[model samples]
Target chain A: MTEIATTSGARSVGLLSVGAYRPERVVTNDEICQHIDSSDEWIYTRTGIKTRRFAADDESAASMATEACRRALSNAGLSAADIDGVIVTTNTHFLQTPPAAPMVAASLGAKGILGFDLSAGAAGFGYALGAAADMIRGGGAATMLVVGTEKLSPTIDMYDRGNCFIFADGAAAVVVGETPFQGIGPTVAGSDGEQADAIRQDIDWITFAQNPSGPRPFVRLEGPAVFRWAAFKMGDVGRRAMDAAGVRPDQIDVFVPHQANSRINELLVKNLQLRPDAVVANDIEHTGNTSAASIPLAMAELLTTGAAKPGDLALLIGYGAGLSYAAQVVRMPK
Target chain B: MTEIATTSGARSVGLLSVGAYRPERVVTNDEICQHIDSSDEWIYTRTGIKTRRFAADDESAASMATEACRRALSNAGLSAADIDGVIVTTNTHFLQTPPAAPMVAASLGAKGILGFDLSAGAAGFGYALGAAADMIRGGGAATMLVVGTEKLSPTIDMYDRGNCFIFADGAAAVVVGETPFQGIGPTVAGSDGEQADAIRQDIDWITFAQNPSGPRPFVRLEGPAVFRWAAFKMGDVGRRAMDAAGVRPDQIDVFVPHQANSRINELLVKNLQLRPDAVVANDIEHTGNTSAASIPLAMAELLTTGAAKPGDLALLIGYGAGLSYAAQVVRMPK
Candidate 1:
């Protein structure tokens, strides 16, 4: 039998840079309350959201992701030609045929690179990051652009208070490349499909197509269920990620859990029992929950605000819809 | 700077087993012609499709994927419990949140496992296969189930002659696990996003929602443009894949290219200049173009028909919408 050959890649992979893009429209709690029976204090206290960005009608997952990727490329001191592949983790692209990744790639002048869209709900960034690192380590690509972007405003239901305040729009990206040492830790990821309905679209496109006169489909969130799961389950995931990275909780310089809610973040911080010196991401206070884009967006916030510095050890975890979750630890990108 | 640790896995990975599921409802060219202004002979001459499967309303991407996964697990002498993760490559699951992967996982009684959906148009299977193998090599999972399932029936515009007969529905899956030696070769994958419009949804879901009275969104295919690209470019991709695997064209015992069109397959075979004795898969004659599912389904057919045996060196390639393509050489599994 003839044996086939395989290529081997770098022993370690890490993020070279990170960048983010938030929509220009800042929707306040008062603006949301105009349609729903809610107040600023009530919404902020419950979800820790004062304002969130709503993408313009013309802005889309591909467009925002392209902008984010450009910034990531620039920050990495590389050009579009330096990227060997592009992975966009998004669920709100709205197209069923052509994936958003290739569009983003085309928009960035990265024409003939490997591009694909990954759908893992809010856990997408973590998942895509893991895949990008592994691909680099496995000789698939030396440099990969991974973008987590979403235009959740179009999918939101203004009348449904449960989701309108919690979901927003934004995009964030990172350039994963070969490193001399292990800068990215092993990823701990899993899904609880039994609770898949905890966060889902109210109806499938087929159902909506069948009944055109009926209410259009919008994302429906079982807030309490998702909150309970995240508050209780994600801490263990984060700890496992730290353990996989051979790091201790006390060594964690920052905690960047998905910005789902301020309360969930608090519980996760408590459950993980991090050192008081650890800088936790509170981007949700203004960014709301960008779902797949949350973790990277929050990470960008920490870096930009000087709350977390480059080379700081950060434990990142994202969990939501599909009841899926992925956690990993990495050194902050420069 | 706090350094993070990373885990490593087997140096090599391969498909442990392959399984496929075709819908029960077989639609012949005659039936498709009834809706369009074409005949069986014309369809068969233009494309190799004699008959194709149209999934029933109850048979969804998740359900078909679960069935295919079950068979794959059984063939590998494993169970759902033994699987550590599931990766679904699909474009027609029909939901914005809660990807089809977790639902398939739930149906298979595989609860707490990593699950996500990958979308790359017709090249999805090749991309997912590469990701799964790299994940195993990068210590992500000991055993991963990679499924390429599509329910294209829902997305097909029956009245559109270019797409109606060319598309079909089916599911195929493979169990990727650690191997002592390399069995799966390096994947040569890339995308031509400049031609993304050659194959795409006619309109996005938002557009459809805004004008419910308009024609519902369906997959549109520029058959001639796609044919020209696939015919002219895929041959080089195949050669590159074979080169990456360090295998000679004569060493290839079988060829399994995407079941896009019969002429495209013939052109690819000629371009690769495979040995005359090499068996080329023609599963498209019965299966039609199941997009991501085509390669695995064709492989299964070759093995089942005794046209190719286990341990045979097969070069597999997939290309389509997104104008994306992936190719690799692999040692067939038992």
Candidate 2:
């Protein structure tokens, strides 16, 4: 029997650079309160969100992703031509066919490359990063760009108090390539589909198509249910990620968990019991929850503020819609 | 500096089993012509499709995917608990959040497993298979279930002559796990964003929401443009896959390309110039274009008809909407 040859590439893969795009318009809790019955003090106390960026009318998920990738490439001293693969992890691209990835690739002047979209709800960036690292290790791609972009403003129900102020628009990207050292750790990822509905669109597109006049499709959330799940379940996920990376909680120099809720973040930090000096991401205070983009966006914030530096060992965990969660440890990119 | 520990699993991975679920409704070209201006003979002569399956009103992409996966687990001699990850590849899941993979996983009693959705248009299965193999080799997953499912009926415009007759509904799945023999080969995948417009939805959901009475969203295709690209460009992709797999064209026992059109298939077969004895899959004759599901569904057909056998080396290629494509060689699954 003739045997099929296998593929292998870099012995180690790691993030080379990171970038982010925050839309120009700032939406404050006061703005949200205009549509829903909420106060700025209450919203801030509960969610740790003061304001979030909202995309302008012309900006889209693809546009934001392209901008982020541009910065990532520049940061790495590379060009669009250097990228061989692209993965856009997003749920709000809005089109049913010809996903956002190819569009972003085209915009970056990398028209003919391997590109696709991955959807794992809020855990999407972590899942995509894992897949990108694996693809490079398996010789499927050399230099890959993974992006998490969301334009949640269009999907939000302005009057829904639970979710109206919770979601925002933003994009973040990272470049993964060959490295001499193991900078990306094993991913600890899983899903609890039994709780899928705890966070999801209120209705399917087909249902909306049939009843356009009914309730327009909007993201609906069972906040308490999701809060409990994340609060209780994600601590083990973070520990497993740290263990997989062969690091202790105290060894972690930075922690960039999903910027979902400030309360959840507090609980997670307490549950993980990191050293007091360990820098934690508090991006949700200003950026709100950008879902898939939250982890990378939070990461960029930490680096920009000089709170974390390149080569710092950081543990990242993303959890939310699909009731999905994925965690990993990696060295901070330049 | 502390190094992040890298993960590695099986040195080699391969398909373990295959399964499919075609809807109960068999719609013929005659039924399609009832709405469009085309005869059955012309349709069959042009596309090599006589009948296609359309899911019933009660069925959905997730439901069909679960059925296919059940059969796959049975064929693999495994249970739901054995699956550590799930990847559902499709553009038609219809939800903006909480992707369909988790829902499918829950239905199969495989909750709390790693799951996500990948979208690469018609080439989704190949992209996903490559991703799954890499995840396994990278130690992110042990036993992964990859499913390509689509329900195209709801997205079709009944009176559209070019596309209404081309797409159908179905689900197909394969189990990928560690194997002593390297049964799966490297994937040759790429995207042409310049041609992304060749196949796409007529309008985004936002556009639809703003103008409900306007033209409803439908799958649109520049048929001749896509036909030329596939006929000319895919030959190189196929050759690369074979070369990467370290196999000669003559070593291939079967060829299963995306069931987009008969003319394109004929051109691909000629372009590759496989041995005269090589078996070519023509599942499209009865199945139409199931998008992501076509390749695996066709493989199942070849095996069921005894035209192909387990352990035989098969060449697989998938291409479409994203103007994206992925090809690889693998041993036929049990």
Candidate 3:
């Protein structure tokens, strides 16, 4: 509002840069199996997760997000002062008030920024990225930090076979700002609440607060249902997003879908009919299902590993809890 | 992305309509005094709160939000099918997964829509309003429903004098869509996470989940600090928003600020140097501080009670936890 006017014929916005942070502690399936009655082979075969990171006791979503933002800012060659807004996407933040973005911003020494936390499960990053890009394109802000970070381990019931080995902790962030080309395409996103419970954190904390002996709340995943949706539905959304950007499948250089699962990634690729040469991201093997952090984390891995380079067109998609999904086509950052 | 092209020189977006849902059970100061060692006079005189509604065991934030959305749709003469996106703002929605927006949409028969949740404390509605308005102005969505609702009773410590009589439950929604003229001006919003602890739910659920005998988490409020910030800082934000809209104080027909307290509203209006004839919404006297729902609830009250007319220019500011704040100038809707 000060100088950034919300004007028409606005400029295109894109990812100035992207970065990710995994907790130092690598938790292997064998380590997790010590708490549950499962074998490493069983875990890997089912979810394609060999290991995942677990944040330390002192580490929270805010702290992880701050670290991710710092790296993202450094990657973009922009200081914290360059940011006018911040957006953190996560469902695992335990603080019921104050939202995570402000705290994360303050920790990065980026004070007095316009920011908020978003919750759309794994699709959260897509939602955040799309909104940040729209705001930049609409001249709402000069530059914004869009972050997706989660300390998901606390929500895992290690004894519960359905969730324990599948969920992990990590953070990833992107610096979205002014760009010459349209880096982010029009997003294809929607929610099907009819299958809301396909993936969820199943109990209210107040329940346990009142009844100490009550069952602990943990994230529940209806594996088969989610798998089906990601393969059949999200693939179409990915194609639509690419089409929206006026890009053909053959033009895609990288396919960076959400790192929800290894199987889902393969299925999505197969369904989308992308060329075999496309570098599909499979960060899920180590990062676990970091939900909102998945897509950005995968994107960071792809870029950092040089599997994808700057100027490459990548098709991105995210789907999870809310049975929500969002897909977009974006140019890979250097 | 499928049919709606991201076009340039897009349509201006404004609040088409507003609606509210207050829980039926009104608990007066006297009723609250029974649970805490505070007098009715102390409660009303200190916070200007006579009564605050508490939800029935069955009335959740999602339920209240759905009802508000229905009313907003009715007021706008739009059906659920007309909404292309939904955003729910709240800090008390305890269901950490499968965000409340999608479920609320499904309940309202607004299926297959793009929806997500926002957490920005009391400023949530204002942040959400600005974001949704930006999305529309940027040609991301044709129409959207923005909701601010909360079931804060569960987070209150009835025995604590600082918050026992202050928090309440309520939901409010607005239908945002294309307007011939600019209905919403640029928003002025920022956060000071340095003072994040000024107001927050003090513990993580996992903390108590693991430590069965640990103290239950309740919202903690630093009354004086928050009061000072709201009166001094938020006043400037409101002015900037008005300036961004190129509107003068004298042009404001109604002043609808967040209903944090009767005193704060009075202070904010005086700080802005508005005309005495401008309608200052004092819904807090009966509704208490519903956090994110306050502004929309106040707007709904002003309109429904015939205290403010359609097309009246209203100055809206919301500030609370996150030490976050947002203000915008908008034309009132029917």
Candidate 4:
């Protein structure tokens, strides 16, 4: 019954802590190559995905989300009880009626807290952070949990090699609260549904009586088509977001692009013209394309391991899927 | 690119027009009798459902969403080109990526538009409406499409019989634009994840790899527990929302309670002390528990058929799944 809202005079919503959750189990490219019509060398060179994190048989969207959120809350030195609200940005939520965020919230002991499941597909990663920043500054929530998560494995098209071996599953959570100018900045997001067919699965959903097997699903994609579109727009937003935040490429310590593809990341860095060391290259070898979980999880890996030192300013951007994208800037939580 | 977000404000969000979508296929009690153990009389007494709509064989979440959205946009007298953002709130969004909103926006021929997703479970019916109102007032979005849809059929544990006959599939969309005072008033929302399991279908989401198909694959609910929670909470927010909007129970017309049960609706009317003429009870004869789609589709039936006229004051409330509940008062679109 508490309002969970607070007023503050700030333009930018600050981030309190950021964390990532990749499944502990590792799925090597060799393992994937054994089942599919592909080789480790071919996939690594083309997708820059070497070893991706695979959730254990026990993990679901909500559980993995909790893993990331635990780290985020821990880094913020806050307990779940201290939180005001929660927002999960995910696709493939666990259940039809309850979804997953509320379960995850209760698991974290934020039982009475208000929460909702949110998604913008790949755009969700950037959108979640941006929404968090604004909500904190705008007084909708005091301390909010923003999570982007997914389990892309079951949905992957095995017969169609285009998508089967590339995408992975994972999550990342951040506890955002109002702070001085240390956490995050404005959000720049855009989407194009017109080109939806470029990447979609042909799943017929109307036949529950005939087949409970679930729509006979498959992931279909035109790789070249998606790549070309992501190139121009993802780069555009990355640049526009930086401009909006009044942050420059030279000032950014590391560039964390959504772990969608290596080529897309390369194009963004080329556009920013930042030195090789200024960007995070884990997209070439980690969780390939985990949708909303990509950027934050990559950040978690970078931050906790000393790659991104405290007080360092960084650029976080994500694109592809939804023909949508978003970007922002933040100083690592100290 | 305009950010439309309003937390508390001088300017208000309005409703331009209202339209609704319901798939034409119908499932009567007799049809479900063969699948489940319950009879027409027993099922009717227990759940207050006689018949419900089912999506066609080709209906995916995105396509059904498009149908609802198209009608809404037409009623709004706007084209897809005019939409600023799309938010599809549902549990059955097709895949984990590319978002369901893009197709929703694209179906109207708009290629590059901003679209997102939200999950509030069955409470999504109310949650997404509140969020839509917020976007319009807060400068976060304009010309927003608020859709709460589902295909609970695939997600139901058909063999379990406990949940199969009680659930149905359908989609509903509403457009929230700026329309004088006829739009939604302040939102009254609450959640207690501790009660989440009460209304939820707690399935083993992790074992998708091991068990291809068996007993209890999908939804399973503790109905009485959920019903009791709904009875108390729905009334609490029902009055709170009416009060916040500067309206009273006597002034309210066309009350739309979630179609969880006919008895629940009766209890709500009694608890709120609303007159019989003011309540919308279209769900009892058919449309057995459309989950999140229950309210708006019911409202559409109310208005298009002349039960609710323009300028009528209405209270729309939802509770279920996520242990989440939301209520709001609005004027019928003229």
Candidate 5:
């Protein structure tokens, strides 16, 4: 029997660098109030979102992801040609075929890279990270770009009080590769199918198309259900992720949970019992809940502002539709 | 420093078992002739598709995937409780959020499992396998289920001469777990985004709704372009995969490439120049182009018919929209 040789084995993997792309146009509560029956004070009190970015027609999910990945490659001091694989985490891409990842990779001039789009909703970023890191460790690829990008405006019913104001558009990316030590810990992730409907498109496209007279099914959110799960279950997930990394709460220098809401984040921190000094990300205040794009976008924001420094310990948690959640600990990218 | 416990390392991953769910209603080429102007001979000779299955309204991507997964789990002699992760490779899932994997996993009674949906067009299954195998080798999952499911009928314009008879519906799954040695080989995968438009949903659902007059963009295809690429590039990909596995064409006992068309398969076989004794799968003659579900469905067909036995060496290749391609050599599952 002939033994087939594979690429060099990687013992562990880490975040090489990160980058983010927020649309130039910010839709603030004042602007949102025009579309829905809501007030700034009321919206701010409930979700802690003052503004969220909305992409222009030209800034589709693929375009934004390409830009973010380009920036990530630059931050990592690598060229587009350096990446061997690309994974885009998105659910809002409008086309049914030719998924965003390959197009995004090509647009970034990262030709010939293996790429695919991942659909895991809000937790997709974390999921993509785990998959990308594992790809490195498994010696399938030396480096991969895990992009979380979404353009939610087309899907959101601007007048739907339950969701319009909560959804936003953005793209962020992290370059994942081998590290000397375990820079990214083992992932703690799972899905609750029972709660899959908590956050979802109200109806499939085909259903609505066949019956145009019926309610146009936009994104519908069971707000209380999602909030409760994020507030409660996510803390346990974060703690478990920390335990997996063998890092204590006190040892974490940064906490970057999904940018769903500040209230969810506030409660999650309280439940985790992390030190008050830890820099918890609040990019949601301006970025809104970009779903799959939230985590890496938040990480990018934190690292950009120097609120979280390179090589700092961080706990990342992401939870959303599928009612899925994934968490892991890692050292911040340089 | 508290080091977290991890699952035992898996030296290599392989397919434990495989299963499929093609809808009961087989629409023969003659039956399809009722809707389109093309004759049975015209369709069969050009594409080699004698019949194809159209899913019932209740047999959705998720439901069909669940059924197929159940069969695979049983075939593998493993319970749903045994799977730690699930990955659904698809393109026609209707929902924009919550995805199909979690719903499928939940339906299978695999309540709390890690799962996500992958979109790489027709190449998605092969892409998912590479990802799943790497996850196992990287220690992200102890056991993973990769499912390829599609409901393309809903997306195809029945009267469209280019597509209607060429598309179908089905679900297939394979359970991947540890093997004593390398049961799966290195994946040779990449994307040619430049040709992404050769085969794709004509227009996104949103665009169609906003302007109903435009060509109702069902799955559109430049048949010649796709043929040229699959017939030419795929052979190279298949050969590279064999080389990576250190296996010669003569070593393969079975050949299971994506069931795009009988013509494509014949060309692929000719290009690779496998041994005369090798069993080349022609499940596509009956199954049509099930897209992402094609490979495993063909695998199940070959195994169930005893054309190839378990433990046989086989070469698997997938190529489709995103103009993506993935190939690898693996041991046939029991």
Candidate 6:
């Protein structure tokens, strides 16, 4: 299929509010001192981290996502009932069927909604969010909620020194609309799954059932390998997408990159040649790498808290896991 | 959001050519006897499933989906280069990233594809196909390939008599394009996650990790409960969607309901009072319940063998897993 033409009205889609939620619990660098063989200095120097949030015993991605959605709804001054469709862009869903989409929609008391579970790992949030927001732009919906949620604790080998220090749990929410405001400009979504295995481990149950004494479940990551891939491709996609969306590097007021690694983020900022104020966290250390939820939460922190303002260009970029990356450009209401 | 008016010359998308791949390994009623305690007569009379196909240790939702994609591409006289986006509608993907959409796309030798995974389980294929077709109609894509793929064997419990006999393994492909060619129409998609647990077992790694004894990753279904729900809703959505698409009941040259259980399909045929000649089946008896892959595979079986000719009116209905269902009307032609 070739590129389908976007309708004129598609340019009208705008944003309501963007919000994010990370658990209150934080894992300090001191805690990792007891579990790993690495020093805080080395860890911080290599990945740029001080501490990161960990979900409470009672918390899950759903709770964090719901909280984020609540904030977004509040920011928009609308109830869930006003929302038309909910797109849950999570690789880590609680269930495959009920879809995180309906879960968030129902809890928000929105009218029963059409739910879709979109998956693409770290790049998942950006691409899937673009799809949802674009659908609204295309008049497929009015008030559509796009969320990226993850509880990496399920897949991460917490005891592993290299990977454990990187992954965290969280969720982020964003609302897309196209009434009177142009909240979103052109979004550039792309994918390349040929290298998908570069970030996954085959740990499903069926494999375990085949051998009761098989190795324990764990995720595999070529840390240095993916780190380089992330540094180069992320900035490339972000830059290219900004260009495609007709936004220039100098016009961007704030940058939010997928929270995958602190070193990668710093390198990406360097590649973009961005000034300190133009980007959120250039280091993933304190926030930890929350996989899919990083971008939206960063947006919430930077936007609602006054780091970003209406009419300012916001550049969003995501890349990881799927070996996929995409960037979307948007401007706040005037 | 309310449906917006399409511009003059707006593209209309519909299914072009369809194909399906069923694994060669058969889990017959007699073979099932070796694991779960159920007789052929009892199983057949109660659930109407005598067997289902296993993945043959090589096939997967991705592989089968690849096969189906190839056939559909061939039938459409297009290659991977002709396609731009892919939607892999399946729950059985092995990778957590890459969305399976790109995996299938890349397997077809396309690296630069904008694709994502959409989850709606049994209804996934119908939803993906319907949504893509509509996007085609609305000028979302000049041509789009959608595939419903599944490898349900790994998710089934041999000891779980109710579900083991039902889940199957397979994949199906459909190429959707704009109208003026007769094979595409409006689609009706809905969800009721309130009862999602009734059909799906909580097997998410995160959910299962909470259980110390190791989670039961197998499917658990109250066959009777779901049968009651599927029988009525399947056709209700089927007929209503057809009507919404401006199609008549008698105009449906063939009705390929999701092949969950042969009995469920039969019930729909009886309730909708569809003529005998209009009923179609790929017989889940030996395929169990292949989840999303059921409908397209059945349609492909009939189409590839020339049971249905070009320009035939095909009504596709799928319901399961999501407490969700979708119905579509397609005028198939080469």
TM-score of chain A of each: 0.99, 0.99, 0.95, 0.91, 0.96, 0.89
How well does candidate 3 reproduce the true complex, by DockQ? 0.57
Predicted candidate 3 versus true structure: per-residue lDDT over A1-334, tens digit per residue: 1212244334667788888999999999999998888899998888788899999999988899999999999999999899999999998888888889989889888879989999999899999998887777665687899999989998887788777898889999999887776777887789899999999877766665677777778888888888887777887788778777778887788998888888878888888888889999988888898989998898898887888887788888988898888888888764
**Which structure is stronger by lDDT: 1 or 4?**
1
**How far in Å is the alpha carbon of B25 misplaced in model 2?**
0.7
lDDT of 4 by residue, A59-168 (tens): 77888888888888988899988787778887656455576777788899877676788777677877767655555554445688888888777666666677777778
Tens digits of per-residue lDDT, candidate 5, A142-231, equal: 899999999998888877888788999989999998776678888888989988889898888778767666676678899988888788
Q: Which lDDT tens digits does candidate 1 get at residues B1-334?
A: 5567778877778888899999999999989988899899999999988999999987888899999999999888999998999999988889988998988899899889997999998899999999988888889898899999999988888899888999899999999998777889998999888988999998899879888877889899898999999999998999999999999998999999999999999989989999999999999999999998899889889988999987789999999888888899998775
Model 4: which docking level applies? acceptable
Tell me how many clashing residue pairs each candidate has: 0, 0, 0, 15, 0, 26
lDDT of 3 by residue, B1-334 (tens): 1212344424577889998999999898998887778799988888899998999977788889999999999999999999999999998788788899899889989768988999999999998998898777766688999999999998888888788888999999999998877788887889999999999988777776778777888899998899988888887898888888888877888898888888888988888989989999989989999999999999999988999998888899989998999888888986
| Candidate closer to the true structure by TM-score (higher is better), 1 or 6 | 1
Clashing pairs in 1: none
* DockQ leader: 2
The reply for model 6, stretches above 4 Å from the true place, is: A1-11, A94-98, A137-140, A273-285, A332-334, B1-10, B35-37, B130-142, B177-182, B207-215, B270-279
- Model 5 fnat? 0.66
lDDT of 6 by residue, B1-334 (tens): 1111222224545566787787887677877777877788988887677777788775667888999899889988888888867778887875555467777877899876766678876888876775565444433346777888988777777777666677778888887665554455555566666666767755765555555367556677767778888886777787766766666666677778888777778778777776668847655655567778888877766766678777777778878765767777776645
Candidate 4 on B92-190: residue-level lDDT in tens? Answer: 764555677777777767756666777776778787776656544445566777776777766666555666677777676777776544457666666
TM-score for each prediction? 0.99, 0.99, 0.97, 0.87, 0.97, 0.89
Classify candidate 1 by CAPRI docking class. Answer: high
**Between candidates 1 and 6, which one is better according to lDDT?**
1
* Model 5 residue pairs with clashes: none
Order of models, best DockQ first? 2, 1, 5, 3, 6, 4
Candidate 2 Cα outliers beyond 4 Å, as residue runs: none
Off by over 4 Å in 1: none
Instruction: Give every prediction's interface RMSD.
Output: 1.0, 0.9, 3.6, 5.8, 2.3, 6.1
